[PDB]
Homo-oligomer: A and B are copies of this chain.
Amino acid sequence: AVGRTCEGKSLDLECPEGYIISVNYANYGRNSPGICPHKSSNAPPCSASSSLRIINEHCDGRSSCSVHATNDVFGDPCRGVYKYLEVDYSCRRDPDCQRELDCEGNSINMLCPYAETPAIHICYAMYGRQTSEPVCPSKSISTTNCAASSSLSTARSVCEGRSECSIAASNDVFGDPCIGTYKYLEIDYICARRGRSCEGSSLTLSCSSGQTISVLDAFYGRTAGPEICKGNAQDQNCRAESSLNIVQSACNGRSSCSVNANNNVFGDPCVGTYKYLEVLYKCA
């Protein structure tokens, strides 16, 4: 996939649910007259050498990113030349995740037994059918373009952040996305590090050994009762929009970050509930 934006505007990259961005090429500069055309003469090819690393920091491993195509971000690789940002990227399932699959009627049991990586993160999920043989054969199949649009959200609502989760490949969980067709559940998961701080405090994330953070899930709000961050727990469906983007933007590609769990960073998604910041991440 290719995205292009002119200097001064922002470029949005996105992948479908359960896929992340994998950057192949990036440049801020100019290598064609026909993109963001101005006048007049052709100049020598222009490329900011900084471009790839910056786009990797801003976008790799995320489902979504927005990058400003400006000299402040990239430097100016050719003064007096109207520039543009071009990215070539692929949307892939994260190869750091473990790949599981069971046919309809079975359950997938995930377990994160280690203390340092105790939290399940669901990377990808599909309840339905995307292929025929040799997956879960049955006489009762009429489609290979079947998926609950809810697959990842439901999987995450069941399992995200838990140390153990058993999830049924069943219509009672996901709904039935293709009546009449024998289905399967395909889930990719990772055992993540977890950080949590109560509202009013800071949260520090850390990777050792010259390793770097990739934030996988984050919310400022509350999804649990008062056994987590004792305080008023009236809204347990509370999540600041853009929590993940903010924490990814603060932390991805670094060895340490600190983020304040507070309303001045995330807004207040649930007035009168005592909130916390909970983050799942990996170190690579």
Contacts and interface: CB of A to CB of B under 8 A. Distances in A.
Interface residues of A, number: 35
Given A31-B99, A32-B100, A37 B137 contact: yes
B35 A101 contact: yes
Given A4-B131, A4-B134, A95 B25 contact: yes
Contact of A134 (B5, B24, B88): B5
Contact of A22 (B90, B106, B137): B90
Given A4-B134, A95-B25, A134-B5, A33 B90 contact: no
Interface centre among A31, A86, A99, A102 (most CB of B within 10 A): A99
Nearest to A98: B31
Interface in A65-123: 84, 86, 88, 90-93, 95, 99-103, 106
Contacts of A33: 102-103, 106
A99 B24 CA distance: 12
Nearest to A108: B32
Contacts of A34: 101-103, 106, 135-136, 184
23 contacts: A2-B131, A4-B131, A24-B92, A25-B93, A25-B99, A32-B100, A33-B102, A33-B103, A33-B106, A34-B101, A34-B103, A34-B106, A34-B135, A34-B184, A35-B101, A35-B135, A35-B136, A36-B134, A37-B134, A37-B136, A37-B137, A88-B93, A88-B95
